[PDB]
């Protein structure tokens, strides 16, 4: 179960975050033990497509090679805080698992600037019992976390030393699919 009401960034700039471009997860923190593997790759695109607020996600386990994409329309709870009902799709946007009630994630942007961000998500998926996940994002897949975002991790009362890096997994991303998925 999730336990955090994450606080959105004061003065969050939604148009800059949701500009159609790609964010890479460089470091993550799962609050519950063994919720997720200790080696993992993930990225997203975020933008408005034909007036609709969207995200496209990519997950890849670099050991098992398990891979999946998702597309969601985000609904607004408050500035920087969203609820997303997801559909699993192939990289071209063809539906593999349709939107269904009870399959949704919340998504809070705790900190963002033009290059980096800190987000929280609570995933709900059928009768999985998952816990809070925080992720440091960057526009550059290889970027070490700078002081702006590390300070935000501290301000959230978290220890950056506990976050697991994704950088030693040889992650390669299909940015073109992520951007085109925003329309799907
Ligand atoms: C960018 C932030 C992230 C978001 C918004 C997110 C969202 C999601 C969503 C929506 C699903 C279910 C997809 C589906 O079934 O169609 C999922 C599943 C999963 N995610 Fe993430 N994820 C993020 C980052 C990560 C990271 C960094 C990890 C590290 C391991 C991770 C591990 C997983 C795993 C293992 C599953 C499979 C869950 C299961 O079915 O048991 N995710 N995530």
């Amino acid at each position: 179960a999730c336990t955090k009401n994450a606080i959105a960034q004061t003065g969050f700039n939604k148009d800059k975050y949701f500009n159609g471009d790609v964010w890479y997860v460089t470091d993550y923190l799962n609050l519950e033990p063994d919720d997720v593997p200790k080696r993992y790759c993930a990225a997203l695109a975020a933008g408005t497509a034909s007036g609709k607020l969207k995200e496209a996600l990519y997950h890849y386990d670099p050991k098992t090679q398990d891979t999946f994409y998702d597309v969601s329309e985000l609904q607004v709870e408050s500035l920087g805080k969203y609820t997303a009902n997801f559909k699993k799709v192939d990289k071209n946007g063809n539906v593999k698992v349709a939107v269904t009630a009870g399959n949704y994630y919340t998504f809070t942007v705790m900190y963002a600037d033009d290059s980096s961000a800190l987000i929280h998500t609570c995933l709900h998926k059928g009768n999985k019992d998952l816990g809070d996940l925080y992720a440091v994002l960057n526009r550059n897949k290889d970027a070490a976390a700078g002081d702006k975002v590390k300070s935000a991790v501290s301000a959230a009362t978290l220890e950056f030393s506990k976050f697991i890096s994704t950088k030693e997994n040889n992650c390669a991303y299909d940015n073109d699919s992520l951007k085109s998925l925003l329309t799907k």
Side-chain angles (χ1 to χ4, degrees), residues 140-156:
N140 182 323
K141 65 174 190 72
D142 295 309
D147 281 334
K148 285 167 201 189
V149 76
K150 287 177 50 195
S151 295
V153 173
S154 174

Side-chain angles (χ1 to χ4, degrees), residues 92-121:
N92 290 327
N94 307 301
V95 175
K96 296 176 66 143
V97 183
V99 165
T100 184
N103 276 11
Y104 69 93
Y105 62 98
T106 68
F107 191 80
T108 299
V109 181
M110 294 161 65
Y111 169 82
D113 60 33
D114 304 279
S115 296
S116 61
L118 174 61
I119 69 84
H120 168 278
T121 179

Side-chain angles (χ1 to χ4, degrees), residues 25 27-28 35-44 55 57-59 61 66 68-70 72 84 86-89 97 103-107 119 121 123 125 128 130 133-135 137 166:
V25 173
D27 302 89
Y28 63 90
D35 249 11
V36 301
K38 254 154 104 193
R39 301 141 192 282
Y40 215 85
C41 294
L44 65 78
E55 289 183 336
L57 314 180
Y58 170 72
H59 283 70
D61 184 319
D66 190 53
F68 48 99
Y69 286 93
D70 291 90
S72 317
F86 53 91
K87 50 185 186 194
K88 184 178 283 177
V89 293
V97 183
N103 276 11
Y104 69 93
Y105 62 98
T106 68
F107 191 80
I119 69 84
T121 179
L123 174 64
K125 182 180 168 177
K128 319 254 136 66
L130 284 208
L133 182 135
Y134 298 91
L137 312 180
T166 56

